[PDB]
Design a protein around this nucleic acid. Structure first.
Ligand SMILES: [Mg+2]
Lengths: 465, 208
RNA sequence: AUACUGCACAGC
DNA sequence: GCTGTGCAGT
């Protein structure tokens, strides 16, 4: 069993300051597609206290946040605001006529509590009515913040899913919503939990919280990736694809398929896929050819629509072992498209064998031991740059089987997904464990459950993230 | 490193019957002979590493339709349903082999001891603790990698009030004792289980 | 639903 | 083995 270690790939922003940290490499570098100064308009929905708190937060973060950093103070820089030392080279702004407000009578009508469906859909409709008033007005916002009040939060929390229907109705709009709880805008009252009743939810330090929220606002408003994943030694335009299977919330066991692409530098495309038949547990909604061929053809159609070319490498990775009919369909479609390099890997969030315990420090982030046929990828770990392991106990590997084998070995696959791990947009945290086509599965399922009938499904991960 | 290199026997006794795995265990518990717990659940056949002529009854199958083959051609088989059957047979064989001072779980599937310090001979420091109440258990898992079968070892604790009464709410304490690892608490347990297993139809090798 | 890591329970 | 839910610490 041969062993090796791996180092994390560097991140490129403006062809300067090749750094691993997504926060320090934003603070002291030139971020991607920067300008001399840009304005991003925010829109807020909620009662007047939430709007006042949101405006106070937005106009107080520009002064500066502390940067003490008790555990490895290079984990985050002190946030200096978006003034002269702007980490995104912009200046945020909020329009006066953009921000909305709902009266107490409608909130009490929601809080009448008939059951946990009617109040939920009434609050949903009213929110999209306020959002349509936002959109049809003159002050159109780039990113909308839904800072719902604590009473409506408890009315939603008394239980469907509010978030799924909210994103399903906002998919037909022009701006992506950026729902943020009222505790997150510096309010002294903590939100009550669901099961533990008389308990207070926890939250990070203020500086890292502001860093994550402001970077998420930066993506959701400005349509531009912050950090790119520059390729390794000898790569081309690949088509990293994950496949997920979800069950609807109306009591139907139809394990419907999806498809997610993260081809160019981290840009993602979410496609609906085909129907769902023949699942005792769920392994083949790619039955024979009639689903898999035209699902891959639709994937290549989207790739031809954007890139006006064809992918050189396809790296279909999932978590459930496939069958011979699905493999035959994938191989036939890729041969009809003339694909050069292919891989069909199933990745295990399982395989209880935990090894390489030696050494005084815990095991490093990135370490490959290749069992004779299958690899043991350690994607979460520790570094001397971060000093220690501030996480929890022992990390969890993944094991990769190239079922229906192809023209690649396991070292290339392990190095590729260890390049693929830290291109995460929901977080600027460094120690990540899952590839983004795998982590995106739950996030796209929780929204695509509630689309329902046949409409324009569209393809943008910005709605789901 | 924690994985364990099983060594297979050279003979396999097979048979073909039309029985059912409930009344068969019923007659084998109301029998008047040596009881054995490595005869496999009848998925259509009957596979074991034992001669049924010298068993207790062996009335599951008739005598003239028993065959003996080599385990090399059956261990190297694709069509992984047979691999699952082989893992089933190996699990029953392991449950029968070290069955005297052990107990098998029904929910979490572990092998708990049933206070004993259990000192074992080793060249390193004598790190022996209470094993028979904070027990010591492990979940065996069979996996065939490359040309060789392998057991996956996973340590855990089974909690009991007096050794016979089951636990009630000791799961958070079990989780808290699990959350204790500083590169000494797991390697020592793997070493202890290897030393116990090294001391029979299945031969166990040295973990890497 | 600012997050990530980790842990527990249920279903097939 | 893989889909669903719920917390605790940074
Ligand atoms: Mg998000």
């Amino acid at each position: 069993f041969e062993t090796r270690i791996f180092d994390e790939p560097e991140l490129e922003f403006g062809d300067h300051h090749h750094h691993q940290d997504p926060r320090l490499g934003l603070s002291e570098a030139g971020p991607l597609q920067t300008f001399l100064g840009d304005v991003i308009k925010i829109g807020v929905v909620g009662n007047s206290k939430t709007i006042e708190d949101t405006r106070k937060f937005i106009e107080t973060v520009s002064s500066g946040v502390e940067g003490k950093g008790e555990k490895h103070p290079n984990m985050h820089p002190p946030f200096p605001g978006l003034g002269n030392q702007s980490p995104y080279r912009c200046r945020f702004e909020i329009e006066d006529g953009a921000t909305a407000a709902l009266t107490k009578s409608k909130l009490d009508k929601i809080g009448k509590e008939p059951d946990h469906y009617r109040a939920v859909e009434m609050a949903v409709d009213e929110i999209i009515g306020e959002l349509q008033a936002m959109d049809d007005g003159g002050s159109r916002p780039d990113v909308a913040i839904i800072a719902l009040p604590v009473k409506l939060l408890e009315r939603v929390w008394n239980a469907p899913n509010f978030r799924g229907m909210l994103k399903a109705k906002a998919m037909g709009l022009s701006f992506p919503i950026q729902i943020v709880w009222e505790d997150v805008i510096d309010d002294k009252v903590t939100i009550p939990q669901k099961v533990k009743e008389s308990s207070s939810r926890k939250i990070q330090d203020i500086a890292g919280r502001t860093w994550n929220l402001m970077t998420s606002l930066y993506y959701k408003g400005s349509g531009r990736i912050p950090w790119r994943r520059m390729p390794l030694e000898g790569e081309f335009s690949a088509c990293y694809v994950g496949i997920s299977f979800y069950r609807e919330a109306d009591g139907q066991q139809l394990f419907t398929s999806a498809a997610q692409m993260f081809d160019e530098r981290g840009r993602g495309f979410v496609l609906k896929g085909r129907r769902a038949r023949t699942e005792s547990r769920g392994r083949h909604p790619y039955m024979a050819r009639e689903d898999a061929k035209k699902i891959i053809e639709d994937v290549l159609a989207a790739y031809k629509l954007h890139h006006k070319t064809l992918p050189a490498r396809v790296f279909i990775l999932k978590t459930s072992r496939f069958k011979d009919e699905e493999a035959d369909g994938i191989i036939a479609a890729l041969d009809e498209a003339g694909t050069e390099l292919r891989d069909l890997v199933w990745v295990q969030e399982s395989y209880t064998a935990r090894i390489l315990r030696d050494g005084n420090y815990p095991v490093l982030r990135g370490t490959f031991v290749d069992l004779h046929g299958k690899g043991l990828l350690y994607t979460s770990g520790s570094m001397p740059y971060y000093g220690t392991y501030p996480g929890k106990y022992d990390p969890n590997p993944l094991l990769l089987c190239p079922h229906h084998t192809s023209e690649s070995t396991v070292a290339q696959l392990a190095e590729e997904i260890f390049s693929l791990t830290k291109v995460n947009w929901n977080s600027t945290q460094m120690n990540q464990r899952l590839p983004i086509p795998i982590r995106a599965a739950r996030k796209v399922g929780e929204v695509l459950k509630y689309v329902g009938e046949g409409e324009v499904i569209s393809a943008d991960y910005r709605k789901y993230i | 490193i924690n994985m364990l290199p099983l060594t297979l026997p050279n003979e396999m006794y097979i048979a073909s019957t039309t029985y059912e795995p409930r009344k068969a265990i019923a007659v084998i518990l109301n029998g008047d002979g040596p009881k054995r717990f490595d005869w496999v659940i009848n998925g259509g056949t009957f596979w074991s590493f034992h001669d049924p002529r010298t068993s207790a009854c062996s009335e599951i199958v008739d005598i003239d339709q028993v065959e003996a083959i080599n385990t090399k051609e059956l261990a190297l088989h694709d069509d992984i349903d047979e691999q699952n059957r082989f893992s089933h047979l190996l699990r029953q064989t392991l449950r029968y082999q070290t069955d005297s001072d052990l107990g098998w779980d029904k929910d979490h599937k572990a092998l708990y001891f049933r206070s004993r310090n259990f000192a074992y001979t080793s060249s390193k420091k004598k790190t022996d603790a209470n094993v028979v109440v904070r027990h010591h258990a492990f979940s065996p898992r069979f996996e065939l990698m490359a040309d060789q079968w392998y057991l996956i070892i996973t340590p855990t604790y089974y909690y009991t009030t007096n050794g016979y009464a089951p636990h009630q709410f000791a799961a958070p304490l079990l989780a808290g004792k699990k959350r204790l690892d500083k590169s000494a608490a797991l390697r020592g347990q793997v070493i202890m289980w290897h030393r116990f297993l090294t001391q029979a139809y299945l031969m166990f090798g040295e973990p890497p």
